[PDB]
Amino acid sequence: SHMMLAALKEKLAALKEKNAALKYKLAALKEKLGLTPELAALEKELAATEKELAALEWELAALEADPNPDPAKLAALEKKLAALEKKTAALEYKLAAL
């Protein structure tokens, strides 16, 4: 679970960095293409992913401070981060196609 926790922290950190980077790419698309509803949908999704990542970070913090972390909480965190990785990959593609 130590290895598990350490790995989830690195995954979370990489998702935060990728998601922040996509905010600058989206803003550049907004300057280039104007205020389309398509870009509005991508901004909303980027914001939601950042919100979810912030919430998960609080749960990771609690588990790190726990002297015997619940394996179920760890597994649930692992699943949620896996979902956000896919969602962030799909957004990376969509911004690259615009």
Solved by what technique? X-ray
**Which CA distances in Å does 13 have to 58, 95, 96?**
13, 21, 22
- Give the number of C-alpha atoms closer than 13 A to the C-alpha of residue 69, restricted to the C-beta side: 20
Domain carrying residue 36: 2-96
The total domain count for the chain is 1
Distance, in Å, from the CA atom of 62 to the CA atom of 88, rounded to the nearest integer, reads: 24
Are 9 and 78 a contacting pair, CB within 8 Å? no
**Structure tokens belonging to residue 69:** 């972390």
**Which CA distances in Å does 14 have to 5, 11, 20, 49?**
14, 5, 10, 13
**Structure tokens belonging to residue 79:** 């699943």
Distance, in Å, from the CA atom of 67 to the CA atom of 72, rounded to the nearest integer, reads: 15
